[PDB]
Design an enzyme around this catalytic site. Sequence first.
Site, PDB file in Angstrom:
ATOM      1  N   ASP A  28      44.039  32.298  35.998  1.00 30.25           N
ATOM      2  CA  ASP A  28      44.430  30.697  36.008  1.00 30.25           C
ATOM      3  C   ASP A  28      43.300  29.646  36.329  1.00 30.25           C
ATOM      4  OD1 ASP A  28      47.301  31.191  36.042  1.00 30.25           O
ATOM      5  OD2 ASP A  28      46.739  32.845  37.486  1.00 30.25           O
TER       6      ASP A  28
ATOM      7  N   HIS B 186      33.607  42.797  54.783  1.00 28.83           N
ATOM      8  CA  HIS B 186      34.145  42.020  53.494  1.00 28.83           C
ATOM      9  C   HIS B 186      35.515  41.071  53.865  1.00 28.83           C
ATOM     10  CE1 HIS B 186      36.862  42.264  49.809  1.00 28.83           C
ATOM     11  NE2 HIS B 186      35.837  41.882  49.194  1.00 28.83           N
TER      12      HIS B 186
ATOM     13  N   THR C  27      32.103  16.665  40.987  1.00 34.59           N
ATOM     14  CA  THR C  27      32.229  16.527  39.578  1.00 34.59           C
ATOM     15  C   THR C  27      31.098  17.273  38.854  1.00 34.59           C
ATOM     16  OG1 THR C  27      31.566  14.360  39.522  1.00 34.59           O
ATOM     17  CG2 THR C  27      33.970  14.788  39.364  1.00 34.59           C
TER      18      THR C  27
ATOM     19  N   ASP D 119      43.141  42.440  53.610  1.00 32.99           N
ATOM     20  CA  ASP D 119      41.660  43.100  53.438  1.00 32.99           C
ATOM     21  C   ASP D 119      41.137  44.069  54.453  1.00 32.99           C
ATOM     22  OD1 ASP D 119      39.442  41.355  51.501  1.00 32.99           O
ATOM     23  OD2 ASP D 119      38.597  42.801  52.733  1.00 32.99           O
TER      24      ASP D 119
ATOM     25  N   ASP E 264      33.728  22.831  32.047  1.00 34.32           N
ATOM     26  CA  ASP E 264      32.369  22.576  32.613  1.00 34.32           C
ATOM     27  C   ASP E 264      31.524  24.049  32.778  1.00 34.32           C
ATOM     28  OD1 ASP E 264      32.239  19.852  32.819  1.00 34.32           O
ATOM     29  OD2 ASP E 264      33.691  20.120  34.443  1.00 34.32           O
TER      30      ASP E 264
ATOM     31  N   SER F 209      36.030  38.584  44.841  1.00 30.72           N
ATOM     32  CA  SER F 209      36.348  38.503  45.976  1.00 30.72           C
ATOM     33  C   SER F 209      35.965  37.477  46.976  1.00 30.72           C
ATOM     34  CB  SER F 209      35.869  39.694  47.001  1.00 30.72           C
ATOM     35  OG  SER F 209      36.392  40.987  46.654  1.00 30.72           O
TER      36      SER F 209
ATOM     37  N   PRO G  61      51.810  37.719  36.539  1.00 29.94           N
ATOM     38  CA  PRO G  61      51.711  36.360  36.076  1.00 29.94           C
ATOM     39  C   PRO G  61      51.687  35.392  37.051  1.00 29.94           C
ATOM     40  CG  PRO G  61      52.895  37.951  34.618  1.00 29.94           C
ATOM     41  CD  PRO G  61      52.496  38.743  35.469  1.00 29.94           C
TER      42      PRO G  61
ATOM     43  N   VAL H 214      51.202  35.036  40.219  1.00 28.06           N
ATOM     44  CA  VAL H 214      50.090  34.663  41.098  1.00 28.06           C
ATOM     45  C   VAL H 214      49.074  33.939  40.442  1.00 28.06           C
ATOM     46  CG1 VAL H 214      51.091  36.636  42.690  1.00 28.06           C
ATOM     47  CG2 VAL H 214      49.364  36.987  41.237  1.00 28.06           C
TER      48      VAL H 214
END
Length: 279
Positions: free
Chosen positions: A200, A69, A16, A39, A260, A224, A175, A177
């Site tokens: 999101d 990566h 938290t 990837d 936060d 990423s 939208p 995903v």
Amino acid sequence: AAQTNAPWGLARISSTSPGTSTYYYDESAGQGSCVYVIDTGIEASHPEFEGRAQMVKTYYYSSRDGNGHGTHCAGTVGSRTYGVAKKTQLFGVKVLDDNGSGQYSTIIAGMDFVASDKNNRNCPKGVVASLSLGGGYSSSVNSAAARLQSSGVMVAVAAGNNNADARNYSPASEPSVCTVGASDRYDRRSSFSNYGSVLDIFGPGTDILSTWIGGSTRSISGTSMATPHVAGLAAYLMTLGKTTAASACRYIADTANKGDLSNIPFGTVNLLAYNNYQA
Ligand SMILES: COC(=O)c1ccc(C[NH3+])cc1
């Protein structure tokens, strides 16, 4: 379970508050789930993967990660030290060449591959795909990500690193995903993170230590790096039975640390991924 001296991003997802260094999580640890890392590949031989990673598909002359990566992202999903879901199975799909580039047509084929390939794998607790890639807006790329999600895979995608509205990037702008922005260890929006209504959730994305090729480790930054935190979190929560592939993004947003983060533009969610694990 408690992992002391964990990477800051792992500690952050079980806290938290910023500024701690122990990662707390249920010992089930994503066992019985699977995460596809779409990837540059995965160095499956890295000791950090403990035999739980394997390459399942490449569109190039090798399935090896000649870049790093993909190995780094896979490490954040599921490596023993650097991973969120330390017992998940990792499946590599190499759609990006060793320079980190890939044609949209190959990326689309890789998404459709995962939607079918999961039927060849044992993932009783559920299936996630982590897509730390993207480029300019493409309806075909967005549609491929939507199909993958519709097929029963929790799709997490990077918002992008343009410090711009993610509406102009794909698959970030799809939208259906889970589009992931990046934050830093002080709970600031990462300076490069895209933003906008399509995001999101945020995850740790600045100075993220993980696995690298040659059996090594390194710290790098990007959306990423935030994306696999969310993908690993989804796998972890699905193993716990708390959510499903169809609802995991919404569940993560509902259970996130709220309000936060600093420097979040008006109209972008102020939500930071959080496992709500009570030790
Ligand atoms: C515009 O000045 C800022 O950088 C800023 C400061 C605080 C918030 C609220 N979290 C958002 C943005």
